[PDB]
Structures are given as C-alpha cells and as structure tokens.
Symmetry: C6
Subunit: 132 residues, 6 copies
C-alpha cells in the first residue's frame, strides 16, 4: 500500500542523494555548573536529500544575526528535542546541523523530513576527514 512501503526510497531511484554523517542521541548528563552535556552513538553514513531553506538575516540587540537552515529528507527515524531527550546531529559539507522540526512519517512510511540549523564548523581529522 502507498502509505506503507517507502515513498522516499522509490523517489531516491530517480533524484540524486547526498551523503550526510548522521549521529544519534545516546544519553545526556549534567557536568558541573548545571550546564548539561549531551552524548551520542557512533556516527554512521545516511543517504538523504538536503534541500535549502531561505535564510534571512535579522537584527537583535543592535547586532546582525542569521539562522542557517537546511530541510533534510532522509529514510530514517529522526528525532529532535523531546522530553528527557536532546536533538540529533548530522554533518554535511563540514558543517554541524541539528534538527529543529520533525516531519515524522516514519512509522507510517519509513522516511522523515526535518528542519535543521547549522551549529558551526566541523572538527577536522588529522587525515583531512570533515568529521569529529
């Protein structure tokens, strides 16, 4: 049935697909000073389509900021902010992105869409790999 199967998997047959370095939330504990540190599973490659979102600059406290966004369609269960849970994280083009929204569709269909925000430059390995 169409709401079953995997629509994004079939759609990946024709359109191209980028490879991101996904990384899943594991457990998250408090360091000193009540700032609260997150930890994650092992990274793994993910086949996803990362379309753009129009990012517009704004002004706050007389400074200029801009929130960088990407909308990722991926064939995986992607979970953002949740009670007792922090967001997920994926690397793309040497930039960290964490999910902000959650389009779900997983348990219905197996795929998902999420709006993710850039966080900062990725750490560079000794060999030149753009991963932590």
């Amino acid at each position: 049935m169409i709401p079953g199967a995997n629509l994004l998997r079939m759609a990946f047959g024709v359109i191209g697909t980028q490879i991101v370095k996904y990384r899943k939330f594991e457990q998250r504990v408090k360091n000193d000073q009540a700032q609260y540190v997150s930890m994650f599973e092992e990274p793994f490659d993910l086949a996803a389509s990362v379309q753009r979102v129009r990012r517009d600059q704004y002004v706050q406290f007389n400074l200029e900021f801009q929130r960088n966004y990407v909308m990722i369609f991926a064939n995986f269960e992607m979970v953002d902010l949740d009670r007792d849970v922090a967001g997920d994280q994926f690397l793309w083009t040497g930039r960290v992105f964490q999910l902000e929204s959650q389009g779900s569709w997983f348990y219905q269909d197996g795929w998902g869409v999420c709006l993710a925000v850039d966080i900062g430059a990725a750490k560079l390995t000794d060999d030149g790999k753009p991963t932590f």
Copy 2:
C-alpha cells in the same frame, strides 16, 4: 449519495491503514484536591490513517518545548474536549494521544478527522503489549 455512504471506508480500499487502540470517555469524577480524574470505557481496535503534523520546537520560560501532533482520519465518531466531557484517547506506537481538534463529518458521512497530541509513553504489559 456522496455526502452519505462512507468516503473514508471506500478510500481505505486503496490506501493502507494503521491499527490504533482507541478508548472512549465513560464518566469522570473529582478526586481529592479538586484535581479531577477522567476514566474511560474498554479499549477497542480502530482502523485509521494517522498522518503527520509538522511539529516545531519553541521556547517558554527559557526552556525548550515541542508539541507532538498527529492528524488521525478514522471511521468513527470522535469527540475531544466538551462541556462536562473530557477528551478521548488512542494508543499508537506505544504513545498515548489525546484529541485536540474535531473535523466532525460523522453524522454527515460516518468518518472524522482529529488533531491529537502525544501525552507520553504507554504502559508496558507483562507480556510486552504496548497498552495500559
């Protein structure tokens, strides 16, 4: 006639449907402290299409929250919050959901659509069933 019959019943012929554990309001009484306890009748299975709603995280009291939503099309009379009546409740993927909107269409057509919010993880039975 087309406003009669059951359009969702015919639409279920082609598209797939999920099975949720629906549970209907019975009557509701006040415990101590004037907090007010709602109780229900026996659960029963329901064939419904549970599509997604874009859930976006927000900020309140310097904390970060996110309201989880699913839009359920079901071939049953579904009643949310009402004068002297509490909301209805269904179980899906081990998550409790309570209805928030009401698309009606029941007395006209026999089916309905409701926006429902996740409440929390379901209780796990001794045998492993994801029901209360």
Copy 3:
C-alpha cells in the same frame, strides 16, 4: 440566467441532503432584569447540507473551551444577529444551533450559507423526538 434560478436546488439533485428543524425569529421582549427573551415562529423542516467547520479547543481564564461550528447551505432566507433582530435557530442531531455569519445569496439566487454555533442538547419530547 445562472445568477438567477437556484443553483443549490439543482445541486441537491445529485448530492445528499440532511433534514434540520429550522425555526425563525418572531419577536423578543425584555423580561425582568433587562435581559431579553427571544420568541420564534413555528418550527418547520428544512432541507440543507450541513458541512463541518474545523473546531479547535482554546484556553481562557485557565480553563479549556471549544466552540462547535457547522456551515449550513440551505435553500431559504437565513438571518443571524441584526439591529432589532435576534438570530435564527435550527435543530440537528439533537443539538441546537444558531447562525453566526451570513452568506446571503438569497435575493440573488434563493439559497444561502451560514456559520452556526452549537448551543446545547435538545429538549427530548415524551415520544422521544429531539425537538423543543
């Protein structure tokens, strides 16, 4: 001519039609305490299509409310609130409804569309009829 004739009358030829118990405003007088009491004509059956309106719960004074809406297409002159005139009332599925908006179209075409709110449960006759 098409803006003449009656488009809803011919549209009723193919689609189904619900029977509501319409009731027209006659006069209203002030009882004690300066509140007005409304009186009405004799009830009469009306052939109309009563589609849904998305009703969403809200919060006021820390309580939870929800306004129940139905959009009625009927082949009759329907008038809601007016200067020196109170709104009309129709019964459907043992629920009272009063008109809130007014699509008019009567003097042009003969039919009309109105948004109507639920008021409460109908009075039950001794024989079980759901009419006042």
Copy 4:
C-alpha cells in the same frame, strides 16, 4: 481592445442582472450643530450584479454588532468617500447601501466594482414602491 470596450457589458449578456436604484452625490452643506448634511441627484435605475460578501458578527463594548456587505459590479462610474465629497447611495431589496471601497476600472473599461454597506430600511412610498 480588451482593456477598452466594456467587459462587464459583454458579461451581462449571459449572466443575469439585478436592478438597483442608484443615486449620485450632488452637494453637501452643514446644518446646525456642525453635523453635515448630504444631498444627491435624482435617483435612476442601474443594472448591476450585486454579489455577497461574508458578513460576520462581532462584539464591541460588550454588545453584538454585524456589518452587512454587498459587492456590486455595475457599468457606471461609482465614487465613494473622497476629499470634499461624500459617497454615493443605491437601493436594493428595500435596503439602503453606501459604497465603502472602489474597484475603479471605469476610465480604463467603463465598469466598476464597489463594496457597499447596508445603512437601514428603505422608506416606503404611499403606493408601496420601496424608494425614498
């Protein structure tokens, strides 16, 4: 040419027309108390399509009001409120209507569209005609 000619005149060949009693602004002087009195030309009949506008009731000062609207397409120069000018007035179904908006299109094409609000019941002549 199409922006020339008269598109509403051609459109009136197929769709029907309602006859309204139009009345054009002539001059206006102030009576006593600095309230200001409007005067008008002779009434004349006008063929126009008077479609509806969804009129929704509202609340002000704990009372309930509702502004009645009609959108009139007429093959005439219709002028509402203006500097040193008051709006025009047309009678339809024994009700006065004053123009509120102005769709212009006259000097381009010869016709116009205006949003008009009901003012009150028309005066009834001795013979029963519903004009002032």
Copy 5:
C-alpha cells in the same frame, strides 16, 4: 532572449494602452521655512496600462480618509522616492499621480510597474487641456 527584448512592448500589440502625461524629476531646492520644493523636466506623453488597485476607506483622528491608487505598467524607466531624489509624476484623467512603489524590470527588460497615489485635481489650461 525573453528577459531581454521588451515583453511589455509586445504585450501592447494586443491589449490597449492609455496615454498619460509623464513628467520627470529635475533637481530640487528648499524654499523658506525648510519646506523643500521639487521641480521637474518638461512633460511628455507616455503609453502605459493603468490598472486599478482596490482602494478602501479608513478612519484616522475620527475622520474618514481614503488613499487612491493606480498600478501603472509603462515602457519607461520610472523612479519614485530615493535618497536626494523626489518621486516622479504623471497626469491621467485630470488627476495627478505620484509613484509609490517601484517594480523595476527596466535595466533587465526596458519596462516597469509602479503603484501610484492620486495627489489632487489637475490644473486646467485656458484652452481646456488637463495639464499644468
């Protein structure tokens, strides 16, 4: 190429055009009291399509105002308000219009679209021409 050439010039082949008396900003100097007087080039005829904009009346300081708008598509470079530069001015149907917005498209394509606001009645020449 299509963004080159002149799309409005070709579009004028089929649709009709109105003739407006355009007039271009020259240089602008201050009279006494620091009110600041603008003056213009010689008027010249312009072939343009002057479509309507829905003008709606509003209330300010308990008075009633209404802003008269026309959207002019003309095959000429049209500049409204600018740093050190005043808006441009065209005459149509004996009414002065000053440009409000600026649809540009000139250096791309040669034509432009501007929203223009009525200023007032035109000066009448001795021979009856509706120009300054």
Copy 6:
C-alpha cells in the same frame, strides 16, 4: 541526476543573462573607533539573472525611506552575513549591492539565489568604467 548537475547552467541556455561585477569577502579588521572595515578579493565578472523585488517606500522618524532590492540567481557560491564574516558585494548598472538573504542550493546543485540591497552609486573610473 537532477538535484545534481546544474539546473541554472542549462536554464541560462534559453533565457538571457546579465553580467555583474562580483566581489568576495576576504578579511575584516577593526580600524580606530572599533568599527570594522571590510576588505575583499579581486573583483570578477559573474553571469547571473537579476530579477526585481517589489520595493515600497515607508516612513521612519517622520522621514520617508525606501529599501532597494534585487533577487540575483547566480551560478556561484554566494555568502551573506555570517558569524565572523561579512557579506559579499556585486556591482550592477553602476550600483553597489550586498546580499541579504541566502537561497543556498550550491552544494546541492552549484547555483544560488540571494536578495541584495542597494548601497549607493558606484565609483567612476578615469576611463568611465562603473567599477571600484
């Protein structure tokens, strides 16, 4: 694959293309008075489609302003304001423009779309070239 390749490159085959003088940010230092001074790479010609954006005049501090916008589709990595990075700048028709939004699409497809504001008149070279 279609999200690969370069859609704007082939789209330039049929539609026309303007030539702008692009200029990329290099570094930025604080001069005296703690204001930063931007400096850039060497200018280079860029092939892009610079469509209009509806620019409307507004009022601030009882003066009248207007922000001039252009939407540039270019087959290059274009970066506006960023943490520790100033926006890029391109010259077109003797006017300086700096990017404001960022449509991205580069690493996906190779092209991009940006909203750019006008800054002021270009510096005129001794030979008459409209470049810095």
